[PDB]
Amino acid sequence: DEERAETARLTSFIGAIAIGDLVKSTLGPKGMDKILLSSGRDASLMVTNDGATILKNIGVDNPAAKVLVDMSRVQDDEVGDGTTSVTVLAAELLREAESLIAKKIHPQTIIAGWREATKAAREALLSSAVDHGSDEVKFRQDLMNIAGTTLSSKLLTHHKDHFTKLAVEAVLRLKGSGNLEAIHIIKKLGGSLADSYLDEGFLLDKKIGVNQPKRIENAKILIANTGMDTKVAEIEHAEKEKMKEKVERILKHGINCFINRQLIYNYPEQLFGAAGVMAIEHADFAGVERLALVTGGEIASTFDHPELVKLGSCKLIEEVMIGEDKLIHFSGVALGEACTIVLRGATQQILDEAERSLHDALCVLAQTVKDSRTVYGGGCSEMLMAHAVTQLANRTPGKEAVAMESYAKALRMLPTIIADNAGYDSADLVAQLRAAHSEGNTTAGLDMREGTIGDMAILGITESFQVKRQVLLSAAEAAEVILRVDNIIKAA
Amino acid sequence: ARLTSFIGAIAIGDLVKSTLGPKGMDKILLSSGRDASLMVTNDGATILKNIGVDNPAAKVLVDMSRVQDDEVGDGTTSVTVLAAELLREAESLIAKKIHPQTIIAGWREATKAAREALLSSAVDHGSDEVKFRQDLMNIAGTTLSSKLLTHHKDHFTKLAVEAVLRLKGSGNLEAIHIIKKLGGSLADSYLDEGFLLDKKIGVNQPKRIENAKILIANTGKVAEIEHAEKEKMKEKVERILKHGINCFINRQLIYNYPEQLFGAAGVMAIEHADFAGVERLALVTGGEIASTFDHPELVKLGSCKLIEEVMIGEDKLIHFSGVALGEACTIVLRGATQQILDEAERSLHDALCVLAQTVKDSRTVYGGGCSEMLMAHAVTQLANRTPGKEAVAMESYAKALRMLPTIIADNAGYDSADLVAQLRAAHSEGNTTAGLDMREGTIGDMAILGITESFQVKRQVLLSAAEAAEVILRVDNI
Amino acid sequence: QDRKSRLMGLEALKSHIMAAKAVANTMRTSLGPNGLDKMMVDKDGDVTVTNDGATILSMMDVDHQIAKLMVELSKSQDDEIGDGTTGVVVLAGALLEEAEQLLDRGIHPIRIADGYEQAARVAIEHLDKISDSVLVDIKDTEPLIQTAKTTLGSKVVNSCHRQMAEIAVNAVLTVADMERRDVDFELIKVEGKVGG
Amino acid sequence: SQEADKCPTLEQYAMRAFADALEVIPMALSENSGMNPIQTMTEVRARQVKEMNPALGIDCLHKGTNDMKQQHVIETLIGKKQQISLATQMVRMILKIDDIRKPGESE
Amino acid sequence: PAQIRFSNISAAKAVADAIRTSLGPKGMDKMIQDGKGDVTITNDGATILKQMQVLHPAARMLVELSKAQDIEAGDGTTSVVIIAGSLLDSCTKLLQKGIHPTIISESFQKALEKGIEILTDMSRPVELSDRETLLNSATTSLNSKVVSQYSSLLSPMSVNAVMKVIDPATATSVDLRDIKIVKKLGGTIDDCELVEGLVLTQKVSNSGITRVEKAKIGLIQFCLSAPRAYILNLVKQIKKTGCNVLLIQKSILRDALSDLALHFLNKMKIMVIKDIEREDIEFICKTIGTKPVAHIDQFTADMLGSAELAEEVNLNGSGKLLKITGCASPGKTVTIVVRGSNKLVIEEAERSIHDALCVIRCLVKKRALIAGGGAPEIELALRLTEYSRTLSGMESYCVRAFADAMEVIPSTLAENAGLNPISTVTELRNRHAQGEKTAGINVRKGGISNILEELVVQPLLVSVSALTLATETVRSILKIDDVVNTR
Numbered sequence A: 001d002e003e004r005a006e007t008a009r010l011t012s013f014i015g016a017i018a019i020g021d022l023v024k025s026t027l028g029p030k031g032m033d034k035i036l037l038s039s040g041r042d043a044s045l046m047v048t049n050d051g052a053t054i055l056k057n058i059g060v061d062n063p064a065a066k067v068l069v070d071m072s073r074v075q076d077d078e079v080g081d082g083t084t085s086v087t088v089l090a091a092e093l094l095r096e097a098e099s100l101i102a103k104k105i106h107p108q109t110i111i112a113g114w115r116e117a118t119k120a121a122r123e124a125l126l127s128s129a130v131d132h133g134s135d136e137v138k139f140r141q142d143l144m145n146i147a148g149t150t151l152s153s154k155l156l157t158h159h160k161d162h163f164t165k166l167a168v169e170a171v172l173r174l175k176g177s178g179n180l181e182a183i184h185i186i187k188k189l190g191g192s193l194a195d196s197y198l199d200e201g202f203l204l205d206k207k208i209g210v211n212q213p214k215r216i217e218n219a220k221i222l223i224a225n226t227g228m229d230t231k232v233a234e235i236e237h238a239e240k241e242k243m244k245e246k247v248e249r250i251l252k253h254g255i256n257c258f259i260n261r262q263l264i265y266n267y268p269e270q271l272f273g274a275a276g277v278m279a280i281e282h283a284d285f286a287g288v289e290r291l292a293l294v295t296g297g298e299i300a301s302t303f304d305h306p307e308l309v310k311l312g313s314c315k316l317i318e319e320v321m322i323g324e325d326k327l328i329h330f331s332g333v334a335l336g337e338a339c340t341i342v343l344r345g346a347t348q349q350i351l352d353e354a355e356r357s358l359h360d361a362l363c364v365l366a367q368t369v370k371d372s373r374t375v376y377g378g379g380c381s382e383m384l385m386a387h388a389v390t391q392l393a394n395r396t397p398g399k400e401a402v403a404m405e406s407y408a409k410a411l412r413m414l415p416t417i418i419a420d421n422a423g424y425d426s427a428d429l430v431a432q433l434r435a436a437h438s439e440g441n442t443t444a445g446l447d448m449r450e451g452t453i454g455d456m457a458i459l460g461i462t463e464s465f466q467v468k469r470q471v472l473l474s475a476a477e478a479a480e481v482i483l484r485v486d487n488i489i490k491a492a
Numbered sequence B: 001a002r003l004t005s006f007i008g009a010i011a012i013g014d015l016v017k018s019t020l021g022p023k024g025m026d027k028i029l030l031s032s033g034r035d036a037s038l039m040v041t042n043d044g045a046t047i048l049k050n051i052g053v054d055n056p057a058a059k060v061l062v063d064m065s066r067v068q069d070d071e072v073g074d075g076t077t078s079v080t081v082l083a084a085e086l087l088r089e090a091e092s093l094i095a096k097k098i099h100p101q102t103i104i105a106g107w108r109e110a111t112k113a114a115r116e117a118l119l120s121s122a123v124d125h126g127s128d129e130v131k132f133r134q135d136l137m138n139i140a141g142t143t144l145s146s147k148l149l150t151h152h153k154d155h156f157t158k159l160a161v162e163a164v165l166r167l168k169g170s171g172n173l174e175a176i177h178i179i180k181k182l183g184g185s186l187a188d189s190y191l192d193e194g195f196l197l198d199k200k201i202g203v204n205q206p207k208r209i210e211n212a213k214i215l216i217a218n219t220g221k222v223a224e225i226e227h228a229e230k231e232k233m234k235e236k237v238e239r240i241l242k243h244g245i246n247c248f249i250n251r252q253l254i255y256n257y258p259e260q261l262f263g264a265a266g267v268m269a270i271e272h273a274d275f276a277g278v279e280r281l282a283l284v285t286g287g288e289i290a291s292t293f294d295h296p297e298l299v300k301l302g303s304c305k306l307i308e309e310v311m312i313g314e315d316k317l318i319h320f321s322g323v324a325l326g327e328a329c330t331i332v333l334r335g336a337t338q339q340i341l342d343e344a345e346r347s348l349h350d351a352l353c354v355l356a357q358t359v360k361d362s363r364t365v366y367g368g369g370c371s372e373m374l375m376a377h378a379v380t381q382l383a384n385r386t387p388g389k390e391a392v393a394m395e396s397y398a399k400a401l402r403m404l405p406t407i408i409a410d411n412a413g414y415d416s417a418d419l420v421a422q423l424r425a426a427h428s429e430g431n432t433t434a435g436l437d438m439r440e441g442t443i444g445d446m447a448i449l450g451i452t453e454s455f456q457v458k459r460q461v462l463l464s465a466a467e468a469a470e471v472i473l474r475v476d477n478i
Numbered sequence C: 001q002d003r004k005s006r007l008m009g010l011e012a013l014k015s016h017i018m019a020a021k022a023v024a025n026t027m028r029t030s031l032g033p034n035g036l037d038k039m040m041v042d043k044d045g046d047v048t049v050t051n052d053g054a055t056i057l058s059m060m061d062v063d064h065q066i067a068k069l070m071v072e073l074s075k076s077q078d079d080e081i082g083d084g085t086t087g088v089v090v091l092a093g094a095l096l097e098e099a100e101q102l103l104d105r106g107i108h109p110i111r112i113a114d115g116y117e118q119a120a121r122v123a124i125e126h127l128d129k130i131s132d133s134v135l136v137d138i139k140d141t142e143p144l145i146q147t148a149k150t151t152l153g154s155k156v157v158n159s160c161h162r163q164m165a166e167i168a169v170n171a172v173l174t175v176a177d178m179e180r181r182d183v184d185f186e187l188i189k190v191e192g193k194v195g196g
Numbered sequence D: 001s002q003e004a005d006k007c008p009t010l011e012q013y014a015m016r017a018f019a020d021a022l023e024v025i026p027m028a029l030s031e032n033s034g035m036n037p038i039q040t041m042t043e044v045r046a047r048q049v050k051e052m053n054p055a056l057g058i059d060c061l062h063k064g065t066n067d068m069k070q071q072h073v074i075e076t077l078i079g080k081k082q083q084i085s086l087a088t089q090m091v092r093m094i095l096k097i098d099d100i101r102k103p104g105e106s107e
Numbered sequence E: 001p002a003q004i005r006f007s008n009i010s011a012a013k014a015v016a017d018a019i020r021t022s023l024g025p026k027g028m029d030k031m032i033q034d035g036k037g038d039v040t041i042t043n044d045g046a047t048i049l050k051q052m053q054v055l056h057p058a059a060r061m062l063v064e065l066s067k068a069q070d071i072e073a074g075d076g077t078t079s080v081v082i083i084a085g086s087l088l089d090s091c092t093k094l095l096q097k098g099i100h101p102t103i104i105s106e107s108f109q110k111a112l113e114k115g116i117e118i119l120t121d122m123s124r125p126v127e128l129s130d131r132e133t134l135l136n137s138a139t140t141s142l143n144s145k146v147v148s149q150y151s152s153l154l155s156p157m158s159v160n161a162v163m164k165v166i167d168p169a170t171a172t173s174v175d176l177r178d179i180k181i182v183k184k185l186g187g188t189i190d191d192c193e194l195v196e197g198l199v200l201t202q203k204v205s206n207s208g209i210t211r212v213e214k215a216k217i218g219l220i221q222f223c224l225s226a227p228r229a230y231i232l233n234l235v236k237q238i239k240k241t242g243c244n245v246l247l248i249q250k251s252i253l254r255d256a257l258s259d260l261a262l263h264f265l266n267k268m269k270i271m272v273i274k275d276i277e278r279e280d281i282e283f284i285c286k287t288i289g290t291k292p293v294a295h296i297d298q299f300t301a302d303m304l305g306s307a308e309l310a311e312e313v314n315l316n317g318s319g320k321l322l323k324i325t326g327c328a329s330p331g332k333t334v335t336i337v338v339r340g341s342n343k344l345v346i347e348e349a350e351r352s353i354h355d356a357l358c359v360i361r362c363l364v365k366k367r368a369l370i371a372g373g374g375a376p377e378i379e380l381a382l383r384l385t386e387y388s389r390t391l392s393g394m395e396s397y398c399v400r401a402f403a404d405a406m407e408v409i410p411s412t413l414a415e416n417a418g419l420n421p422i423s424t425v426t427e428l429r430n431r432h433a434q435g436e437k438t439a440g441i442n443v444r445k446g447g448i449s450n451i452l453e454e455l456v457v458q459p460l461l462v463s464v465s466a467l468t469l470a471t472e473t474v475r476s477i478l479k480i481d482d483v484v485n486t487r
């Protein structure tokens, strides 16, 4: 895989630029959706507006692209939003770096300039991060808007109010230690996008049937080991008798709710019904975590050690039939944090789309409660950062000034990309926004519903400070890491 | 046909790019091997005069450069490279689908701002106010860069300072003549007041004359007709015998037979002198130019005071001292090669011209690219203020202005990506008094260095470059 | 090596419309007061820059017979008045380029031509209807100054445009005849002197 | 376009074509002015159908309003009449021609 | 970007053009030898599209349009594809005119909503139940074929099934769940009869008794398997529960009922039923109310079904069927007992019945109706053009292009009728503008006139759904910017 002193870096940077241009379109709340193929034999023709899923489904070999993909993975895992923005920003930075290297500028000077350019941008964000009273004096419109920002280009534009209300109830009384197990989304197919309401239960009923009582107050819940039953014949009979003795040892507890990971056929179900025990098989790990935390049902392999008082405790458990479907509500938990979001969509794509959108929404709400400061969205923050960087570059001598100017240009390119996917004249709009923003301070920003500039705060469409700052930092560090590579066995 | 014309203009600009600054690269004037042995010149202005041009847009650019050359001073290289930069930026902006009309409008409203900024920082020299010479020293030196006649540069500056009170009435430039021979050194410059034409009668003709009224000749069995024409010619020379003139331009050829009669009549037969000297005599002494001499008898003659013929320094160094006006200051050097002739001629002509507009317009700005960075800063400040797509236009104008002294830095062999950036960053605080110096290769306060350029030629450069760039950009087809 | 020279009617119309959209859509950019002017270069030794559409179509050489037809009769119109040649050329090109799709729909060209004539009559009567023309422009020396701003507003000649406007109004006054209202070749207001 | 609502068949399609063909002049003017060739023409058309004023054109000089009564942009009836009539004559006669034959064939 | 948008446009237009001429009662039929010896002979658009090879994504989306229009209403399958192709061809001009696809998509959405509301407000709706007009629409759909003489035997029975249960599903609309369908080979078409509840058509051979008023019904999918541990237990469970009719499922092994098991199941002479299609298994389960349990242990007293009569009577002489009435929740799919010795009187009868049930449900989902024959399409092409003239902005041209592209359906309908398409479509447009809504084409009488002579008539919902789906798919295609391989 031996390469040359310029070919390796050129092809790696071109690959990174190509990865950036791949996701460049699906940016802003006007994204150009793209079809993902796995051609094979009968590959599905699925199409998405979200670039993060594209990266999850991109197969690339170039190591620079590999680093960008890994950075995007960390981006999505941490906050869940802005990943497309990070990728396109890094691509623009690398394109500017390529242009500068074409002007025989050493990469080390570019990195040295970019580090303190990022420092200047971050301190500008801290300066302009207006901390509204949404988390101080309990304003609701800011929560409304922050939920609306990350829910854009989705199919929950109707009951978004319910999602925002759940965010409000979270920031009121679910803010224990930055709750994240409360993000429970379960839904089915057939209906519409206006089927949003509150739940706190797992959508499986008693496998015995309708004969077992629905209302069970005391719930001693754990995980079993084997399937229930009363020289193969002798050994299996003796094992049956030994495990029956085991259950008689554990039958003194008086359990009502219990999870049995291993599969249950007719006979274990009948034995459970005779013993008043319910079984859930291969439950969702998030559901098990919620049962362990909110309720108290810990995960385990056997029941050898828990014999007298080492079982989980619960307040109330019930299982009912609602709406001709497996609608089971676990009313009566010890603490009502795991407010499950239950929906009823039409296609299978909603199952993952809505769940990931709500994961991102709860993540950004956690960011807002952690840092009540926030900045105006719609390219306002990026333009302000670019303005500060340009000021510092004009003030700073040396060759790193050109690198800092390129950094400002790449920052300004982001609203241009956002506006292009909306069909507006991005060049005119961005030029007007920049010329205003030089004197028309950050109270102004980009409005998308009309294709015109506006006073961004009046529109109220704002995004959390934490995610924006960490997007800036991640993009800067990814560009710096990719830039420092010059000539290695790197591509073929 | 926009792309091809833009590339042609860009190539024309790049061809002269390397010659910018007083460190420019040399060029070879080649052609078919018949007479293409070797010709070299550092100045890019003479390069354009000898360029085989095919693109009509490049033809327009070259014609504009010629207009700049025969207009005041020498800035043609700067104008051409600035135009090339502007069209390169225009090509870049067209690549991002920006209509040429918006670019032209932005360029106009940025050129006006740059011009007013240049007006703002203009400083009036003391040679026309309190009679300083060091400002004259610097203005003569800067335009005489990339040259070697620094030894007798004092004589050049003496003719410079002596021009304002005697040699010009409103900026006259035709009263100064330059002539030189082959064989000498840098210590050959001297003050003369006429050409170098010697008497042809022999050695018995007196060196001094009484009074000169100088004009121009008319002319130089068929034997009977020839004899009648000869008799008429003898009557003509008898008529000029009583004219009493002592100097006379002989445009047409005269052989010996009437040549001796001209000498015996006191009329010197100046055998087809260069019309430059005739024009100098016309405006300094008062010798008019006509077609025939028979009609002028007593009122239509010339006007002069004293003319003498002498030999100095083994050559025909005739000094036409004592003419009516003392403005015919002629510099007589002694070069060594053919290129010395044209090089000294163009250098002295351009220096004398720029001195003429300095004594006409005494305001000036510091050179060395500080004024360029000042205009670039002004247009950049303007660009950050107004909205619309013309922001890209003025910022590209600023980019071209920034790149103008970067070429100067590169031609000196120094770096270009730091000291230009350092100058730009400083110029917000290290203002117009700052500048760029090639003597050391660093940024210093340009005023103490003292090298300044006349404001008029700089404004002319900016205006001409903007106009030519706009004209070429406005063309889209054919 | 099997070239054919047959030209059937519909493909002939396609070729003629292509030629017309070639001669049009070329000088289209020159329409308007800020239209992109065309730099005309002679095939031997001359080069010039101009924006008048009649001039650029007159200097330009065209190979196709349709283009020759259109340019020569545009020359005739320029002789008749001398204004609107750009509009005529661009409008004819527009009609042909958008009637190509009608031809593709299968309409016979005669039907298109007669419908176009009917539309032209409709346009003529409509424009004659909505005319807000002023009728006092006889002793209108001051309004005449602002009459010619549009035809001189494309350059920086506005510094002394009023002087030449007064020159023009004096010229029309000294030849103002209410009977014929014409100017002949001998009365030409043309003389070009270099320098100044 | 209004007249195409009460028109026989192929004249209806021809006049519908003629409307769009007439609309080219505003797009050409706006494109030469550098602004959006189609957006500005559509906006001025909607304004001119909203307002009975017939002087709402395209301001290629980037002045204040789209009304040229203040801007003194004026053209005579005769010139415009001749221009439109000659353009129609051109399209008619070029549509009439269906074949061109040249002596000296080179098959 | 645009390089792939053009490819998608070309592929979708090509796959739409391959079925362009098949529209209309005079539709020309096709023959594509793309396969391994396939004798393609038919004029139905849906089968041509589904049998056509699909390689480009755009073709797959258009086939999905065909399928969605078929499942939603069952009519105008070619209409939606032709409309989508016309829209794509029209927006090609806009794309090469410099309009970004987002503007085109938004303008198409506005055009969709305007067209939907203009098409429904001034249409001709039905107010009362008016089974006469449903019969008339059926006759306009059920005649002119082999089943034309059987219209009076098929349509009234379907109408009676509709009136028997006015299902309150999807805004009190009679859905696909009136009374469960059955069909048996043989007999004659005159043997059709309407049932009430579960009916079994599987072969039963019991020499004893299988007719008890309290017909307990069980579902034991667990059958005999080759190893007594799990063989005779089901017999004891059945005897204790007393079930008399228990259908057998062979999901375990083929030997569902061996000789010994049959003899043990011969002591009560339980009803033996095999070969149940899986799609009808859950329908039968919800009809009886019992659960589909394949475990004998789970089978308890609560597993007993509800029934009133169960007889293995030889209906129509030689047709052995088991009619069951008075169940928990019968009514899975509208009953039409397809009886007939001939092969065509089975398949064509079933196809015609499916078309009739689709159109009847179509008119009960929404009670508005319009006259076919290109009338709605010209009406849209006029009203949307008027809107676009009144509509401001730069999207007005896109709306006008949408309206103009909506003219293909009458044009191709008339071309397949042999008329000069351009002249007749524009004459229809003039007559529609200066006249009434119901102006259409008279395809099979040689002329153009009003609908009162024609009265082809179609429900509003077919056109509404076709328009909506076509607009949504053209929106989706236009918003596509790139397609990437190598998952």
Ligand SMILES: Nc1ncnc2c1ncn2[C@@H]1O[C@H](COP(=O)(O)OP(=O)(O)O)[C@@H](O)[C@H]1O
Residues within 6 Å of the ligand: A026, A027, A028, A029, A050, A051, A052, A080, A081, A082, A083, A084, A085, A149, A152, A377, A378, A379, A418, A446, A447, A448, A449, A461
């Ligand atoms: N109403 C709006 N107006 C303007 N810009 C918006 C609006 N809503 C969202 N945005 C833009 O969308 C961007 C965030 O979307 P993005 O991070 O691409 O989502 P994802 O991370 O899921 O891809 C922000 O930069 C913001 O400027």
Ligand SMILES: Nc1ncnc2c1ncn2[C@@H]1O[C@H](COP(=O)(O)OP(=O)(O)O)[C@@H](O)[C@H]1O
Residues within 6 Å of the ligand: B019, B020, B021, B022, B024, B045, B074, B075, B076, B077, B078, B142, B143, B145, B367, B368, B369, B408, B436, B437, B438, B451, B453
């Ligand atoms: N000694 C010097 N110090 C600083 N700048 C200089 C010096 N000599 C020349 N320059 C710069 O070079 C530019 C002109 O260079 P050049 O094109 O070679 O001369 P000309 O303009 O006469 O053709 C001027 O703008 C001037 O500022």
Ligand SMILES: Nc1ncnc2c1ncn2[C@@H]1O[C@H](COP(=O)(O)OP(=O)(O)O)[C@@H](O)[C@H]1O
Residues within 6 Å of the ligand: C030, C031, C032, C033, C052, C053, C083, C084, C085, C086, C087, C150, C151, C153, D029, D057, D058, D059, D060, D061, D073
């Ligand atoms: N100031 C202006 N505002 C708007 N349109 C103008 C203006 N000046 C000229 N035009 C348009 O430019 C077109 C060309 O005008 P003109 O130059 O007189 O004809 P030609 O281009 O054929 O010589 C005219 O149709 C006119 O509408």
Ligand SMILES: Nc1ncnc2c1ncn2[C@@H]1O[C@H](COP(=O)(O)OP(=O)(O)O)[C@@H](O)[C@H]1O
Residues within 6 Å of the ligand: E022, E023, E024, E025, E044, E045, E046, E074, E075, E076, E077, E078, E079, E372, E373, E374, E413, E441, E442, E443, E444, E454, E456, E458
């Ligand atoms: N007898 C008829 N007279 C006039 N028009 C008809 C007649 N029959 C059908 N049509 C029209 O032709 C179209 C045919 O629909 P089509 O797409 O062929 O359905 P399918 O795809 O199920 O065969 C209908 O929309 C209808 O309006």
